[PDB]
Amino acid sequence: MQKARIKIASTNVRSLDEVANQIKQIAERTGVRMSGPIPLPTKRIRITTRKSPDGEGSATFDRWELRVHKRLIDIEADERAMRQIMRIRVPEDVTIEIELIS
Amino acid sequence: AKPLNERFFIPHEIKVMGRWSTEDVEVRDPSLKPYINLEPRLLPHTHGRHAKKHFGKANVHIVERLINKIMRSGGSHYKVAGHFMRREHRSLNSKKVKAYEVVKEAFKIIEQRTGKNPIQVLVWAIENAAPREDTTSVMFGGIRYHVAVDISPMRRLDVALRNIALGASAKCYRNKMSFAEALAEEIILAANKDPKSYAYSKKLEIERIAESSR
Amino acid sequence: GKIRQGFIKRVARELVNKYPNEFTTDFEHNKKKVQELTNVTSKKIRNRIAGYVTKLVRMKMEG
Amino acid sequence: ATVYDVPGDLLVERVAQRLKEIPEIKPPEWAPFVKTGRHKERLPEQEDWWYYRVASILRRVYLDGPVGIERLRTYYGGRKNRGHAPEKFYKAGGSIIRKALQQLEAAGFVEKVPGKGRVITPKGRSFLDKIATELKKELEEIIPELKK
Amino acid sequence: DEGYPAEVIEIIGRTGTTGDVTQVKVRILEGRDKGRVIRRNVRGPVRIGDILILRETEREAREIKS
Amino acid sequence: IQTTGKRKTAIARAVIREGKGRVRINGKPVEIIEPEIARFTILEPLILAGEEIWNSVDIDVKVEGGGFMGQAEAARMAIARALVEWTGDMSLKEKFMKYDRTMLVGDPRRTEPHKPNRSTKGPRAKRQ
Amino acid sequence: AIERYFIREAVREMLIDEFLEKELRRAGYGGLDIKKTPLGTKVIIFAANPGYVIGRGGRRIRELTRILEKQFGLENPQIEVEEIKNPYLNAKVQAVRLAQALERGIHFRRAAYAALRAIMNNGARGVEIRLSGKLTGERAKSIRFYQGYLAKVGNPAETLVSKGYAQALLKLGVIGVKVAIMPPGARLPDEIEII
Amino acid sequence: YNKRKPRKFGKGARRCIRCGQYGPIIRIQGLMLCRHCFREVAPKLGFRKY
RNA sequence: AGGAGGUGCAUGGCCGCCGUCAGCUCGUACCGUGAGGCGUCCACUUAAGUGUGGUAACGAGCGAGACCCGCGCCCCCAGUUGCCAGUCCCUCCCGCUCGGGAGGAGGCACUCUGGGGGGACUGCCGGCGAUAAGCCGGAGGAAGGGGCGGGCGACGGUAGGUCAGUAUGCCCCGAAACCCCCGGGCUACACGCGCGCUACAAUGGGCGGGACAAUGGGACCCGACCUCGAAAGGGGAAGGGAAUCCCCUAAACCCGCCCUCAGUUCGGAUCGCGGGCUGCAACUCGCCCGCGUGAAGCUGGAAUCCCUAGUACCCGCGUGUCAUCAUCGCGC
């Protein structure tokens, strides 16, 4: 038994759900078992900074957030199934990284 | 740990703290009957939403309230006779386990030294240390005058209990004599209407002045 | 305070006038009817509309 | 029975006094003049302080399994007074616990699993659970509820 | 301690300068004026039917002038 | 039978089955917990319940997160629900809710986020 | 580090944006997009008119095609330039256009009102133009001309509105211009439609 | 002799790309930009307000 | 060219407070010759110019609100986060043989994880309110009456400040007010005031024991593990470009012993030595390891700042620029 682990990461949630949905359709169309997409913990990058450019005024601070969501999909070996993933249109924001595990 | 386990198991038949089941206690003052909570509960702590309730303070057990206003007893605008009563060495605030232990010890002291229900001794002290008149500066056209005013039972409870707590702090603060000993001594003095206690003394002071503001 | 917002007061009266019979005192029935008869995406304001149209339906049969 | 059924303090005391017998455990020459950690500000009051550490360390191996120098430093660390600055938490010493672990290893109660730390041997487990059964029985006829 | 408890019935309204004094009507439950209804003030929170302790029954508060 | 319990940040998972009566927190006897206040907090549900329930069921609860007191309260909630589901009689529920509310409602309160202008000392704290 | 990678890519992006803003200001440079592929990096530049971007025989964009590979280090930059579907719906492009008009000695009132009308009949739901600085003398003034529905708070303000800030240079100094444009396709949360 | 000396540490080793300010240059995963610059570009980097 | 040279009544942009206060207005109609007024007024009600009910006005727009983030319960989907959830099997430690504990296989319960849906709506009842709007109490219920912590702060004003972060008018310098480099200064101290850290011991200190966190960060980086040195530190090193390797210990807590209240078995400022880390170098100008020494202060007047529900108060932790300068800031 051999498996492929795919991690799909995006800031946009809807792009990620569309990519996952088309991967699911591909995996069920090729009839190869797929582990359901496990949504791994989303990374919240936080940066705070003082609003005022100079040093004047009340101590005012602004919070800036980046929520980036990533998901894990594991599939069983099938060269036909792996041929169709490189043709998947991937949006500019979604990054897909694929590794092969025994 | 043997006293610890035996005190764990003794209140298995529903007893406040470890001992001193509350059935035998009697409230003499009619004012505080519907406010002093005498429900039998093992541990005097509920972490309840009583502050957000207007009348949720009546539900809190008098011993839980006791620990509550014990933990807050440190530091104030009260420079009573020019003293700053702060707890600098492991203050009572937020360490409700240490306060829990100290009330346990003072209750044991009361039991031994008085040979009767410490809860009932506290009940008598609360009755005896609640003032019955305060003063308010009411004005008509910017001519203020001090007028005697009747105190609610709940405010009487609050002020008296704060007064005994502050008496305990005044006794223990800056002395070899421990906090548990101070609290036991203050509560026994207040139980028998002893003027030596801060609680009964300041009850008398609150009654007075308002005495002359008629 | 709990003053109901004016725009819901407007749309509630309008939906009252155009289907006087499609809304009854049952709260949940009215909630679904306003769910499907409008394009509201915020479920909360849908519940507000439902809560108010309940009161209007109640107002009806006494006068 | 197991260590889980008794207080840790009493079990540490019992293991310390019992390991006082074994010639393996012996304080080094620099020990009495060196406190337990950097964060500590006064020397240990008593002279059995070495044995207790072993009675602690072995007990930790009964629970945390493979444990090396650094994690035992992490557990033992405590709060220190820095002067006018706020008190801050620091770690304990390392050579002391390293020598204690070496003495236990030469005693055969603990072995080394490289890359993970040091684990407890079967003999150490048997000794510890015999101690635990004895102490549990003691607090049983003291406190009958422990027969449950 | 010559005190006299009395039972609250009706709350006239917040009184005093800061409203922290509350004006209520109380019925004397024991004493030389048993059953008599007096307008009396209350510092600290009060409700209907509280037992308030009096030092002097004769003292009274002026009607709240709006 | 399976049960869970939420409180502050200490979350408890409890499993109750038939047994002699042993009740264990993290596989440790409930009588030998070093803080005593936590002991009463964990103990509250089965005192008023009764001794037959105590000696008729084995309960294992594991609590992770928060403080030791929070762990005690979460274990209290877990064991309360455990007896609730194991007995499934109305009277125990009625007396559960009469003695207090928390063990059938939980304490959903948390710590509010800290806000600037001396955030360190608390959310609602500020300078002089 | 996936973080360090995404922030690096988007930093490359906004730096390219600013570089083209200071390069393509005369071109009415309105928008940018970037696609990576093994062949190279495709840049998609929406301008008020690509005619100026293309330059003379492509001598302009080719320079840019060099630049996007040297200072920013993009392997194989492929430039594609396009037209904005309605520049009157881009508050940034309209702001740049009005700033250029002001710089030409055109009266601030007449230019601003004509621009407002021109954006309006193009179908924009709501238009606001604020002009600040030395507008009629040494002492600076701020004057705002509004028209239509312009919700100025909430998430929709940060989402559906098009915003444009410009600085116009003149002998007296610098004039700041802000422009807010509501596209017509958006709808309000409190607007409830009925069937 | 006009070249500035190399510095791998300290404030002088660091300079904002945009305005060149030697001072506040936040480095959460390597932004390399002045703090005041950050305000007018954070949405362009995708940062939102919540 | 450049200016860190000035010019914030030369400006743009930006921040502050008035003030998330309730306000600002427009289209047309009406009154007044006009200045201008109405809408935006009055009784009630709202946190609001939010509405109710009457009004020479009716509508509209900006504002609050709706809007958006997250907590509060459940469900689904997803399970390599986590567990003798039920568990034949294997390995191990005891034991009263009663039993207790741990891991490999296996299971996915449940926490967690992250996408959607429901659920809380004055949803119902009583009282109030003119039967209106709306208010209070109650019931049910994880949470009902802006549920809760937040973001979105207006027309205008203050020539507030900021051209010394940016663009930037005017003027000034053009081998200086330009460029580079060494050292000092940015720490200079009999002094007034603001804000913070330590302390004024027994409530407590020393010895040992136990159960307890998220915030985020980790490649010239995070670093288990092994070895030397008491320690700072020296040498090797697994795993890791992040639910997976480290920061990770929890603190407060109580438990068994020692001490028995005083400027001290508190307090360490402060003075010298030996060693150690970053940096080219740290006396000016860092901290740490050990020793000796280790001050006042014993609760502090006049005057005066803030807080209301997990909130004060107390405890402890990651992180900001970053070797250190923070006894600071944010966040946990």
Short mmCIF file of N, CA, C and O (backbone and C1' of nucleotides) in Angstrom, two decimals, chain I residues 208-245:
data_model
loop_
_atom_site.label_atom_id
_atom_site.label_comp_id
_atom_site.label_asym_id
_atom_site.label_seq_id
_atom_site.Cartn_x
_atom_site.Cartn_y
_atom_site.Cartn_z
P G I 208 15.14 21.11 47.95
"O5'" G I 208 13.95 20.07 47.80
"C5'" G I 208 14.24 18.69 47.60
"C4'" G I 208 13.11 17.82 48.08
"C3'" G I 208 11.84 17.87 47.25
"O3'" G I 208 11.92 17.08 46.08
"C1'" G I 208 11.28 18.05 49.54
P G I 209 11.11 17.50 44.75
"O5'" G I 209 9.66 16.91 44.98
"C5'" G I 209 9.46 15.56 45.38
"C4'" G I 209 8.09 15.35 45.96
"C3'" G I 209 6.92 15.76 45.07
"O3'" G I 209 6.60 14.77 44.10
"C1'" G I 209 6.58 16.59 47.26
P G I 210 6.80 15.07 42.53
"O5'" G I 210 5.40 15.68 42.07
"C5'" G I 210 4.33 14.84 41.66
"C4'" G I 210 3.04 15.16 42.37
"C3'" G I 210 2.12 16.16 41.69
"O3'" G I 210 1.36 15.61 40.62
"C1'" G I 210 2.32 16.71 43.97
P A I 211 1.91 15.66 39.11
"O5'" A I 211 0.68 16.23 38.27
"C5'" A I 211 -0.56 15.54 38.22
"C4'" A I 211 -1.71 16.48 38.44
"C3'" A I 211 -1.75 17.71 37.53
"O3'" A I 211 -2.35 17.44 36.27
"C1'" A I 211 -2.03 18.39 39.77
P C I 212 -1.45 17.30 34.95
"O5'" C I 212 -0.54 18.61 34.94
"C5'" C I 212 -0.93 19.77 34.23
"C4'" C I 212 -2.04 20.51 34.93
"C3'" C I 212 -2.38 21.89 34.39
"O3'" C I 212 -3.24 21.82 33.27
"C1'" C I 212 -2.30 21.93 36.77
P A I 213 -2.65 21.87 31.78
"O5'" A I 213 -2.97 23.35 31.30
"C5'" A I 213 -2.64 23.77 29.98
"C4'" A I 213 -3.05 25.19 29.71
"C3'" A I 213 -2.46 25.79 28.45
"O3'" A I 213 -3.24 25.49 27.30
"C1'" A I 213 -2.13 27.29 30.26
P A I 214 -2.56 25.07 25.91
"O5'" A I 214 -2.80 26.34 24.98
"C5'" A I 214 -4.11 26.85 24.75
"C4'" A I 214 -4.10 28.36 24.69
"C3'" A I 214 -3.10 28.97 23.73
"O3'" A I 214 -3.56 29.04 22.39
"C1'" A I 214 -2.83 29.97 25.83
P U I 215 -2.50 29.18 21.19
"O5'" U I 215 -2.00 30.68 21.29
"C5'" U I 215 -2.91 31.76 21.23
"C4'" U I 215 -2.29 33.03 21.74
"C3'" U I 215 -0.99 33.44 21.07
"O3'" U I 215 -1.19 34.10 19.84
"C1'" U I 215 -0.74 33.57 23.41
P G I 216 -1.52 33.24 18.52
"O5'" G I 216 -0.72 33.99 17.37
"C5'" G I 216 0.50 33.47 16.86
"C4'" G I 216 1.67 33.83 17.73
"C3'" G I 216 3.03 33.36 17.23
"O3'" G I 216 3.56 34.22 16.24
"C1'" G I 216 2.81 32.84 19.53
P G I 217 4.10 33.63 14.85
"O5'" G I 217 5.60 33.22 15.17
"C5'" G I 217 6.50 34.17 15.71
"C4'" G I 217 7.73 33.52 16.28
"C3'" G I 217 8.44 32.53 15.37
"O3'" G I 217 9.24 33.16 14.39
"C1'" G I 217 8.26 31.63 17.55
P G I 218 9.47 32.46 12.96
"O5'" G I 218 10.48 31.28 13.29
"C5'" G I 218 11.74 31.56 13.87
"C4'" G I 218 12.41 30.32 14.39
"C3'" G I 218 12.48 29.14 13.43
"O3'" G I 218 13.46 29.28 12.42
"C1'" G I 218 11.84 28.37 15.56
P A I 219 13.00 29.57 10.91
"O5'" A I 219 14.37 29.59 10.11
"C5'" A I 219 15.39 30.51 10.47
"C4'" A I 219 16.77 29.98 10.20
"C3'" A I 219 17.22 30.02 8.74
"O3'" A I 219 18.56 30.48 8.66
"C1'" A I 219 17.45 27.82 9.59
P C I 220 18.85 32.05 8.57
"O5'" C I 220 20.14 32.26 9.46
"C5'" C I 220 20.08 32.11 10.88
"C4'" C I 220 21.08 31.10 11.38
"C3'" C I 220 22.28 31.69 12.13
"O3'" C I 220 22.69 30.80 13.17
"C1'" C I 220 23.04 30.50 10.24
P C I 221 22.22 31.08 14.68
"O5'" C I 221 20.68 30.69 14.68
"C5'" C I 221 19.68 31.69 14.48
"C4'" C I 221 18.29 31.10 14.50
"C3'" C I 221 18.01 30.10 15.60
"O3'" C I 221 17.78 30.70 16.85
"C1'" C I 221 17.15 29.29 13.56
P C I 222 18.15 29.92 18.20
"O5'" C I 222 16.95 28.88 18.38
"C5'" C I 222 15.63 29.35 18.61
"C4'" C I 222 14.63 28.24 18.51
"C3'" C I 222 14.78 27.11 19.52
"O3'" C I 222 14.24 27.42 20.79
"C1'" C I 222 14.44 26.21 17.36
P G I 223 14.83 26.72 22.11
"O5'" G I 223 15.06 25.21 21.66
"C5'" G I 223 16.04 24.39 22.28
"C4'" G I 223 16.16 23.07 21.57
"C3'" G I 223 17.26 22.13 22.06
"O3'" G I 223 16.92 21.40 23.22
"C1'" G I 223 17.33 22.26 19.70
P A I 224 18.09 20.74 24.11
"O5'" A I 224 17.44 19.42 24.70
"C5'" A I 224 16.15 19.43 25.30
"C4'" A I 224 15.33 18.27 24.83
"C3'" A I 224 15.83 16.89 25.25
"O3'" A I 224 15.41 16.51 26.55
"C1'" A I 224 15.46 16.89 22.93
P C I 225 16.40 15.70 27.54
"O5'" C I 225 17.30 14.82 26.56
"C5'" C I 225 16.90 13.51 26.19
"C4'" C I 225 17.95 12.85 25.33
"C3'" C I 225 19.34 12.74 25.96
"O3'" C I 225 19.46 11.62 26.82
"C1'" C I 225 19.54 13.62 23.78
P C I 226 20.30 11.74 28.18
"O5'" C I 226 21.81 11.78 27.68
"C5'" C I 226 22.40 10.62 27.10
"C4'" C I 226 23.80 10.87 26.59
"C3'" C I 226 24.79 11.48 27.55
"O3'" C I 226 25.31 10.55 28.49
"C1'" C I 226 24.99 12.52 25.44
P U I 227 25.80 11.05 29.93
"O5'" U I 227 27.08 11.93 29.63
"C5'" U I 227 28.31 11.32 29.28
"C4'" U I 227 29.40 12.33 28.99
"C3'" U I 227 29.69 13.34 30.08
"O3'" U I 227 30.47 12.82 31.14
"C1'" U I 227 29.61 14.43 27.99
P C I 228 30.47 13.56 32.58
"O5'" C I 228 31.40 14.83 32.36
"C5'" C I 228 32.80 14.68 32.16
"C4'" C I 228 33.48 16.02 31.97
"C3'" C I 228 33.27 17.04 33.07
"O3'" C I 228 34.07 16.84 34.21
"C1'" C I 228 32.91 18.07 30.99
P G I 229 33.53 17.27 35.66
"O5'" G I 229 33.42 18.86 35.57
"C5'" G I 229 34.57 19.68 35.67
"C4'" G I 229 34.20 21.14 35.60
"C3'" G I 229 33.14 21.60 36.59
"O3'" G I 229 33.62 21.84 37.90
"C1'" G I 229 32.57 22.38 34.45
P A I 230 32.71 21.40 39.15
"O5'" A I 230 31.23 21.80 38.71
"C5'" A I 230 30.11 21.01 39.08
"C4'" A I 230 29.08 21.82 39.82
"C3'" A I 230 28.31 22.85 38.99
"O3'" A I 230 27.20 22.28 38.33
"C1'" A I 230 29.05 23.82 41.03
P A I 231 27.04 22.45 36.75
"O5'" A I 231 26.62 23.98 36.56
"C5'" A I 231 25.41 24.48 37.10
"C4'" A I 231 25.39 25.99 37.07
"C3'" A I 231 25.78 26.62 35.74
"O3'" A I 231 24.68 26.71 34.85
"C1'" A I 231 27.00 27.64 37.49
P A I 232 24.88 26.61 33.26
"O5'" A I 232 25.27 28.10 32.84
"C5'" A I 232 24.42 29.19 33.17
"C4'" A I 232 25.19 30.48 33.22
"C3'" A I 232 25.97 30.84 31.97
"O3'" A I 232 25.18 31.40 30.94
"C1'" A I 232 27.37 31.08 33.83
P G I 233 24.81 30.54 29.63
"O5'" G I 233 26.16 29.76 29.28
"C5'" G I 233 27.14 30.34 28.44
"C4'" G I 233 28.52 29.79 28.71
"C3'" G I 233 29.04 28.73 27.76
"O3'" G I 233 29.53 29.25 26.53
"C1'" G I 233 29.43 28.02 29.96
P G I 234 29.52 28.33 25.22
"O5'" G I 234 30.61 27.20 25.52
"C5'" G I 234 32.00 27.48 25.44
"C4'" G I 234 32.82 26.22 25.54
"C3'" G I 234 32.56 25.15 24.48
"O3'" G I 234 33.20 25.42 23.25
"C1'" G I 234 32.64 24.15 26.61
P G I 235 32.43 25.14 21.86
"O5'" G I 235 32.40 23.55 21.75
"C5'" G I 235 33.58 22.83 21.46
"C4'" G I 235 33.35 21.34 21.48
"C3'" G I 235 32.19 20.82 20.64
"O3'" G I 235 32.48 20.75 19.26
"C1'" G I 235 32.16 19.78 22.76
P G I 236 31.27 20.78 18.20
"O5'" G I 236 30.55 19.37 18.39
"C5'" G I 236 31.17 18.18 17.93
"C4'" G I 236 30.33 16.97 18.24
"C3'" G I 236 28.94 16.94 17.63
"O3'" G I 236 28.93 16.58 16.27
"C1'" G I 236 28.82 16.31 19.90
P A I 237 27.78 17.14 15.30
"O5'" A I 237 26.44 16.50 15.88
"C5'" A I 237 26.25 15.09 15.91
"C4'" A I 237 24.97 14.74 16.62
"C3'" A I 237 23.73 15.44 16.08
"O3'" A I 237 23.18 14.75 14.97
"C1'" A I 237 23.82 15.69 18.43
P A I 238 22.08 15.43 14.02
"O5'" A I 238 20.75 14.63 14.38
"C5'" A I 238 20.77 13.21 14.51
"C4'" A I 238 19.58 12.73 15.29
"C3'" A I 238 18.23 13.19 14.77
"O3'" A I 238 17.76 12.37 13.71
"C1'" A I 238 18.34 13.57 17.10
P G I 239 17.38 13.02 12.29
"O5'" G I 239 16.01 13.76 12.57
"C5'" G I 239 14.90 13.05 13.10
"C4'" G I 239 13.87 14.00 13.67
"C3'" G I 239 13.57 15.23 12.83
"O3'" G I 239 12.69 14.98 11.75
"C1'" G I 239 13.93 15.89 15.06
P G I 240 12.89 15.73 10.35
"O5'" G I 240 12.28 17.18 10.61
"C5'" G I 240 10.96 17.32 11.11
"C4'" G I 240 10.72 18.70 11.65
"C3'" G I 240 11.07 19.85 10.72
"O3'" G I 240 10.07 20.09 9.74
"C1'" G I 240 11.93 20.29 12.87
P G I 241 10.47 20.52 8.24
"O5'" G I 241 10.53 22.11 8.31
"C5'" G I 241 9.59 22.84 9.09
"C4'" G I 241 9.33 24.21 8.52
"C3'" G I 241 8.78 24.24 7.10
"O3'" G I 241 7.87 25.34 6.97
"C1'" G I 241 10.82 25.41 7.18
P A I 242 6.30 25.09 6.77
"O5'" A I 242 5.85 24.31 8.08
"C5'" A I 242 4.51 24.38 8.55
"C4'" A I 242 4.31 23.48 9.74
"C3'" A I 242 3.43 24.04 10.85
"O3'" A I 242 2.73 22.98 11.51
"C1'" A I 242 5.64 23.72 11.66
P A I 243 1.13 22.91 11.43
"O5'" A I 243 0.75 21.73 12.43
"C5'" A I 243 -0.56 21.61 12.96
"C4'" A I 243 -0.53 21.30 14.43
"C3'" A I 243 0.39 20.15 14.82
"O3'" A I 243 0.99 20.40 16.09
"C1'" A I 243 -1.83 19.63 15.44
P U I 244 2.58 20.56 16.21
"O5'" U I 244 3.14 19.09 15.96
"C5'" U I 244 3.06 18.10 16.99
"C4'" U I 244 3.66 16.78 16.57
"C3'" U I 244 5.10 16.82 16.06
"O3'" U I 244 5.81 15.66 16.49
"C1'" U I 244 3.71 15.85 14.42
P C I 245 6.62 15.67 17.88
"O5'" C I 245 8.14 15.81 17.45
"C5'" C I 245 9.19 15.25 18.23
"C4'" C I 245 10.38 16.18 18.31
"C3'" C I 245 10.24 17.34 19.29
"O3'" C I 245 10.60 16.98 20.61
"C1'" C I 245 10.98 18.15 17.19
#
